[PDB]
Amino acid sequence: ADSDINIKTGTTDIGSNTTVKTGDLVTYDKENGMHKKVFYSFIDDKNHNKKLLVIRTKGTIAGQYRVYSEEGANKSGLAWPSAFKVQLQLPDNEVAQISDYYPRNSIDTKEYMSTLTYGFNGNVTGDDTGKIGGLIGANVSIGHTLKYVQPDFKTILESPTDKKVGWKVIFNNMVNQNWGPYDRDSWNPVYGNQLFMKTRNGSMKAADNFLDPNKASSLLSSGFSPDFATVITMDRKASKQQTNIDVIYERVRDDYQLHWTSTNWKGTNTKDKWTDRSSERYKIDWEKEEMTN
Amino acid sequence: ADSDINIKTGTTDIGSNTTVKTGDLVTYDKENGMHKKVFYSFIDDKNHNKKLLVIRTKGTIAGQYRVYSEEGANKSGLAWPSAFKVQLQLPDNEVAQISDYYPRNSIDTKEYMSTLTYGFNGNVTGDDTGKIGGLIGANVSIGHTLKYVQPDFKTILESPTDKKVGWKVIFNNMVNQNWGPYDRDSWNPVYGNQLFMKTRNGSMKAADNFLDPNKASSLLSSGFSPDFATVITMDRKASKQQTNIDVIYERVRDDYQLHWTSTNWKGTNTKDKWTDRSSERYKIDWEKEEMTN
Amino acid sequence: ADSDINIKTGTTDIGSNTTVKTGDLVTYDKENGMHKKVFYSFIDDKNHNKKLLVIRTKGTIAGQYRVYSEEGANKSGLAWPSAFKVQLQLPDNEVAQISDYYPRNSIDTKEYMSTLTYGFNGNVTGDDTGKIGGLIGANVSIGHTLKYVQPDFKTILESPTDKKVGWKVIFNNMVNQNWGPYDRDSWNPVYGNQLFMKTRNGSMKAADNFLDPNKASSLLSSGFSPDFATVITMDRKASKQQTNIDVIYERVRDDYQLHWTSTNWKGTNTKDKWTDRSSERYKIDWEKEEMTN
Amino acid sequence: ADSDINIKTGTTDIGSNTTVKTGDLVTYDKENGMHKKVFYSFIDDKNHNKKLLVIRTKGTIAGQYRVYSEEGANKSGLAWPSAFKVQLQLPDNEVAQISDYYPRNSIDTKEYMSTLTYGFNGNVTGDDTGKIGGLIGANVSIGHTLKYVQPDFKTILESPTDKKVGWKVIFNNMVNQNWGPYDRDSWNPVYGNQLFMKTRNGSMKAADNFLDPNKASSLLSSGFSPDFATVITMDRKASKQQTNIDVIYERVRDDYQLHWTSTNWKGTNTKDKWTDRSSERYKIDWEKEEMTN
Amino acid sequence: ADSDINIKTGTTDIGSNTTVKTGDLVTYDKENGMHKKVFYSFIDDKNHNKKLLVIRTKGTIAGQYRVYSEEGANKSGLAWPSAFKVQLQLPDNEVAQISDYYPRNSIDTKEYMSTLTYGFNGNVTGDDTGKIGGLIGANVSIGHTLKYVQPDFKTILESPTDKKVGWKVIFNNMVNQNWGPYDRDSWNPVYGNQLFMKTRNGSMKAADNFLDPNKASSLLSSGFSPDFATVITMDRKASKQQTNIDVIYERVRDDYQLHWTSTNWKGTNTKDKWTDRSSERYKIDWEKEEMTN
Amino acid sequence: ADSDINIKTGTTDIGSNTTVKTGDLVTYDKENGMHKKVFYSFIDDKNHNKKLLVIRTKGTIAGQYRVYSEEGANKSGLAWPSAFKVQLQLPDNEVAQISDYYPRNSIDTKEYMSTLTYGFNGNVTGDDTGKIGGLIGANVSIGHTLKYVQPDFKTILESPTDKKVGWKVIFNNMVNQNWGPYDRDSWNPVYGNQLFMKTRNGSMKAADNFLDPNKASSLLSSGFSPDFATVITMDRKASKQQTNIDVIYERVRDDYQLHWTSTNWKGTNTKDKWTDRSSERYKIDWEKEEMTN
């Protein structure tokens, strides 16, 4: 908070009384199904120390959630997106540097509750024959409650060096058919990994027995569209005013297979089965304030 | 957040010191009952890289929730809107590209709560005859609670390629007469799919035994009015400054029928029975900044 | 959100650097008790495509909640407002069109909660005579909880065509004397529809045995005052610059009667008994920018 | 929402580039204890259609909560404010009209919750003599929960005609000594109406046995200060530019009496016992833009 | 709050009508994996008393969560970041001083709830043989509930002297596999410290039996990126206008080892095992308003 | 609220169209460990009545939480900050006066909840031999629930006279190892004051058996940094334009000692054991608008 140090709000920010030359570059990778896009903005504030360039890799990455193989009615497979990644890198010989990046790791909290209860009790029982009985009782109770919120997908910022910064979205866990959340490492001795399982002991075909993509999370089938911002600073006295960047949009898929053993369906998951990578190299012209490729 | 990178807020946005020529085109499709409307805005910022055009397909799509067929008092049908869709497409030979789209898939969260309780107990019982009894007891309890919010209709952004982007609204589930939520795949061995069922064993006519549209969701009967935004960018050095777009407003209906078997009503659902499509082609004139059709 | 597409906020809106000529027309219908009023605004933005006119039918519609007929102390009736409606229409031969309308159908949500509990138990019982007993037990519990919010009156946007758009407010349900909510179709074999019932087996007169209007919802007795906005767009090259509109303020009342059968009061409801309609025709002068009637 | 129709926010409002001549008139009615005050504002926007005048009857109405009569220690009375009212009226021959009024009836909502629970149970009991016993059990549970918020006093807008508009504040219910809420119609066969009762079977004097005004609601003793706004529109071509208004500040009191029957206090309430009215007539000069009286 | 003293908001802040010369310095420490960065801003307000310089050590510190040693399948180790620290210091002979620092210790609250319950009970039991029995009972209950929120990592502001100010982020506690939260001092006689334990009695390799970094907190593996602000004030009449600062980015790691004793895994933690320090010295030029190193 | 009296917001505030000369004075007391700092602002509004000076004693006071004495393993002590204070005073002969002070005592609320439950019960029991039994029962329950939020440290504004105003922060209570909150006056016949106790019957050294400062509140070890604002007004016609102020930053510590009696640790607290005071005198020059010392 700028106002908590008694400084007037917005005083220390950069971008005042200057013209920024924005831009846009859109490309679609048919092979990998990644509609990648970057939105750049050249800021050169005279009162600042270095030339600035903020890059927002908005884009979009598809989900690719479908059944890849079926072998009769006994067994079938499934490929689902385990993780989405997007990273930027600079050549080792480059002179520019990575300064900031908005989406960053944040500390997560949890509730906690302690309960203590005392009790007392007493009743008098009687019947027709004149018998009279008594009872005096007491009890204690101690309870601990802990609650927290867990998303389906969890975004993470991989440790950014001077040259490369990258983010990552992973599959935390999912609730299937209103039952307890499952994850990739979940296991059951009878049924196994019931993550994407429709019916435990259905009589349908193996390929048919898979969770409807509508029921599952949206990011599994329709994909994940990132919104990540990074700024590159270049010294204004550098000999060479041209810079190259690489943008990668890799996606990791897992293999989920269910098998009909004797009576019930049994599901098995094989993590990190395939990876699809789409890297494109851009060129920066600091003197002309334009990025083109 | 622009202010989290120490950049002054609003600096990187586009649209400063320029005139945007907005517009409006309204058309009604009597056959399909779709009051489609698009709101365009031509932005040509000199400091930007490409000419811009944001298209907001506000429009409105009717619900069409009515009983289509009745066969005596024994059985009758019902047609209800299973899903609403709206998509924009560009010709394969076109030079413009799709850049951004506001309504996008978002990660959904869930609560979770773990409870543990210890207990102790002890009572002393006595009667008139001098008998004295005792009792010492203890107990443990473990509980897991998981809660989440689920809407009636769920909007999804279908995987957007370079040329076409489309959205989709599907029927998640509905609560009928304050009872447990039902969906298209819900089944009961006795009654079946009780989604749009008034009384389980009523004596009325089959056509009469259907849930009142007022009781059901508003989107089923009065329809769904979208609000989706997409921006198309065209290079300012292109040889041809004219572009064509296609806008589709398809709606998918399902067949719900209840049948009087012997004593109670039995309901069955047949998903994706009909689809109504309304496509219109617009022409864009980048040089004159007007879209007309 | 305009800022989520990287466009500067407010850039795509219409109404900049222009003068709008507002207005007001107020009329009271003594026969129907409807204080109708419309607030118009002529917007002609040069950068826009069509002339604009936004109409806000604020007005007010009375409730008319009273006992219409009494027949001794045995039975009496009651008329209450089941639904309020207001709609605008254009002639079929007109050239203007309906573009937008603010209050629109919105998707409803609901909470859901799944609980699972394991238990264990064990006690030791003894008496004076040296008898020693034991007990070991366990239990499981599964619970489903679903909660949602339901208003007394539910506003709905009837499917708007190109020429006419109309809204609707209906009676969802009401809580009577802190008891479970009742609606028009509620039935009880003994008492019947206990919606507007004061006492189940009171000895008072039939006309006296009705729920106090203060206890009931405000809209039943003091009426409902709408606030609905619609915009009409007319091509600026049209030959005729005069337009006619019709505004309707219909209100639907139901007949609720309770009858003293032998010991207790029995209530019956007859939906859609009366309808009061108040239609007035306005004239639009686009050239002079004034609506008068 | 103005921004939801794509119109720039604040465009359709009235009051731009004009001077409003406000004012204030304060009067105190010693007989009725009503500190009435009105705050007017003359708005004449050229771009508008009619001359405007918004009147805010802020004022203040006292509570008058006191014991009026006592007859020994056997019985005593109490007068408390059952309802506060304030209304404006215009002469039937007047040409001005009532257009708008801010505080208006609003729809009220309620929560609802449905619960279902399954259970299972089993224990093994044994004693010293070798006897072994068993027990297997199960249970079901269905629960309905409904919660809502109810204020002590409820403001209502009486059905406004073209010439007169009036509001109303009534006594919904009150919680006495942390016990269940009571209202004017509450009855108990033993104690009666225990609304303003201190002790059920106290030995104090009848006049002394009344709830402390500090314990009760503030509006009962210190009164209710309204804040209601209304706008009057007059055609600018009218022959006569002078208008008369009447402002009433009526307050309704009830009679609460408790009686010592044999052992306990019994309370009875007589609604609408007294009404205090304070009407003042103001004169409007549209040409000079001043209201004086 | 400035407005709560009747002073116009923002009047007492500093930074009005002046130019601030910001800057940026980025450096990466490959040996320690700390991407440190500082963002300075020179403010010299004529109406103020001293020259100002606010330093924001944004940077980023990696997590370094990995298994360092394995000795067969019997035992293995783990190094995890126990605490992150970042501190600024000034030479003892310097003339500048530390004035303010935004992130500061804050008081934390907790809920509390007291419950009291009275009960009564009575049943009548009878059988075929005409025996009649009775039972009258009562009970009391007292309960205390206390709940609070506890984060995984807790930021602390170490006692700031005139020359040096430093912050600190420590490991409060973590929830492992949805079980009760553990911390560094947690101990169990059977299993020990089960903080980073996968399975209590798994048969896998010791190195394999460790909690997945994705399952654990993000700061453990991907590191912590600080955002801390400090302002240094220097008298404008000082003889020497050059100042030196030191910035440290130390990180503390702990040694977590689990051992297979006979049947189950036993975990032991050794706090404060390693510390990695990265100190860099900057030079301040108040006359030229630039910090370079 | 300024806008609730119909006055334009911000009209009555002071500071418009004037220049304020701010300042800063920083000093560190090595002996007491108090980094005291004051931020002044001279406001002389011509439309106001007196010259103004708002003083914000931001500063910082250390915690000083450490073990002062140990006597073998049998007993040891502990000094912890019981209360932090900061106060400003003016000489009795001075002409300036204290006008306002932002942090002020506020009324605190509490929830309350009353519950009432009715029940009914009935079961039929039978066995193989044909015996049939019955049981009819009922129960009532009344419950009172009261919940509130209590912070660890509570700030208080000591009664401000014309010349001196001072604040105070005291130790309300603390939760130790997730157990019930303890305070300075808490006592247990067996263990005593268990406020800063690690283990009830641990075998470690007495000095070692103390709660970790990280586990305890942050203000205990890292100290409390105040933010308090006060404004001094001086008549502009006074003969003498120089004023003196005194600022005190006293801190009060308590003595907590635990003693090993025979089997368990016993803790005793001695409140108000030490007080550290740091007073500095400043000089105000109203004519030159500068405070220096």
**If DSSP states are collapsed to H, E and C, what string results for A102-146?**
CCCCCCCEEEEEEEEEEEEEEEEEEECCCCEEEEEEEEEEEEEEE
CA atoms of F60 and F62, how far apart (whole Å): 7
Any chains having at least 3 CB pairs less than 8 A from chain D are B, C, F
* Neighbouring C-beta atoms of residue D16, cutoff 10 Å: 12
| B16, B23, B241, C233, E283 from B19: Cα distances, Å | 9, 13, 19, 21, 48
Which run of H or E residues covers position B220?
Answer: helix B218-222
Q: How far apart are CA E33 and CA B59, in angstroms?
A: 54
- Helix, strand, coil % (nearest 5) of chain F? 5, 50, 50
Of B289, B237, B227, whose CA–CA distance to B52 is shortest?
A: B289
Best to test chain F binding among D149, D178, D227 (most F CBs inside 10 Å)? D178
- Residue E2, classed as helix, strand or coil, is helix
A6: nearest CB among F39, F178, F180: F39
Report how far residue D71's alpha carbon sits from residue D207's, in angstroms, rounded to the nearest whole number: 9
Q: Which whole-number Å values give the CA distances from D169 to C35, D155, D252, in the listed order?
A: 22, 4, 10
Do A171 and A193 form a contact (C-beta atoms < 8 A)? no
Partner-chain residue, chosen from C6, C112, C116, that has the shortest CB–CB distance to A39: C6
Given an 8 Å threshold on Cβ–Cβ distance, is F178 in contact with A116?
Answer: no
- As for how many domains chain B has, the answer is 1
> What token pair was written down for A113?
């509750």
For residue B175, what is the nearest residue in chain D, using CA coordinates? D114
Closest-CA distance of chain E to residue A161, Å: 6
Query: Which of B6, B11, B118 to mutate against chain E (most E CBs within 10 Å)?
Result: B6
Q: Which residue of D has its CA nearest to F116?
A: D180
Q: In chain D, what residues touch B56 (CB-CB under 8 Å)?
A: 6
Mapped onto helix, strand or coil, the DSSP state of residue A52 is: strand
Which residues are CB-contacts of D17 (< 8 A; sequence separation ≥ 6)? none
Tell me the three state secondary structure of residue A60: coil
Burial label, C237 (beta-carbon count in 10 A; 0-12, 13-18, 19+) = exposed
Residue A6: its chain F contacts at CB < 8 A?
22, 39, 56
Count of B–C CB contacts within 8 Å? 194
CB proximity list for B85: less than 8 A, separation 6 or greater: B166, B167, B168, B169, B248, B249, B250, B251, B252
Distance of CA D274 to CAs D118, D253, D254, E36, E261, Å? 58, 5, 7, 79, 89
Touch of C by A (3+ CB pairs closer than 8 Å): yes
DSSP count for chain A of H helices, then E strands: 1, 20
- Distance separating alpha carbons of residues A150 and B114, to the nearest angstrom: 13
Distance from CA of B277 to the nearest CA of A (A): 22
Token pair, residue A60, equals: 């979009």
Note whether E touches C: 3 CB pairs or more under 8 A: no
A112: nearest CA partner in chain F: F178
**If we measure between CA atoms, which residue out of F35, A68, C24 comes closest to residue D231?**
C24
CB–CB of D110 and C15 under 8 A? no
Q: Bridge partners of D231?
A: D54, D100
- CA-atom Rg of chain F in angstroms: 29
Cβ separation of A225 and B104 shorter than 8 Å? yes
Answer yes or no: do E179 and B114 touch at CB < 8 A: yes
The partner residue sitting opposite A127, judged by closest CB among E43, E131, E142, is E131
Q: What are phi and psi of D222, to 5 degrees?
A: -90, -5
Nearest residue to E178 (alpha-carbon basis) of A271, B149, C111, A145: A145
8 Å CB contact of A157 and E229: no
Per-residue tokens: C23: 């207005």
Phi, psi at residue D221, to the nearest 5°? Answer: -100, -45
The minimum CA-CA distance between C97 and chain B, rounded to whole Å, is: 7
Give the residue from chain C lying closest to A40, CA to CA: C6
Q: How many A-B residue pairs are in contact by the CB < 8 A criterion?
A: 189
Angle among Cα A147, A148, A151 to the nearest 5 degrees reads 145
**E183, two tokens:** 């911390």
Q: Which residues pair with B14 in a beta bridge?
A: C7
d(CA C13, CA B43): 12
Provide the 8-state DSSP code for C233.
E
Partner-chain contact E144 A116, CB within 8 Å: yes
Determination technique for this entry: cryo-EM
Could you tell me which chain B residue has the CA closest to the CA of E181? B114
Phi-psi region of B153 (alpha: psi -120 to 50; beta: other; left: phi over 0): beta
Q: How far is A148 from chain B (nearest CA, A)?
A: 6
Say which CATH number the domain at E215 has. 2.70.240.10
Reported as type and span, the H/E element at residue E189 is none
Tokens at C60, concatenated:
């007010």
d(C-alpha D221, C-alpha A272), whole Å:
73
**What are the tokens at A252?**
């990791």
Query: Are residues F149 and E107, on separate chains, in Cβ contact within 8 Å?
Result: no
> To which H or E segment does residue E41 belong?
strand E34-43
Q: Pick from B36, B40, B19, B18: which is nearest to B28 by CA?
A: B36
Task: Give dist(CA A78, CA A269) in Å, integer.
Answer: 9
Task: Provide the β-strand partners of residue C273.
Answer: none
Q: C175 vs D9: CB contact, 8 Å cut-off? A: no
Name which of B108, B253, B246 is nearest B170 in CA terms. B253
Q: What is the DSSP letter of F7?
A: P
Residues of D within 8 A of B39 (CB-CB) are 6
The beta-carbon neighbor of F43 closest among E11, E117, E119 is E11
Say how far apart CA C235 and CA C52 lie, in whole Å: 9
Give the chain A residue nearest E104 (alpha carbons): A4
Which residue range forms the structural domain that includes residue C245? 1-293
A180: distance to nearest CA of chain C, Å?
A: 8
Q: Chain C: which residues have CB within 8 Å of chain A? A: 6, 112, 114, 116, 144
CA nearest neighbour of B182 among B203, B200, B168, B205 = B200
Looking at the DSSP bridge assignments, the partners of residue F133 are E127, F125
φ/ψ region of C108 (left if φ > 0, alpha if ψ in -120 to 50, else beta) reads beta
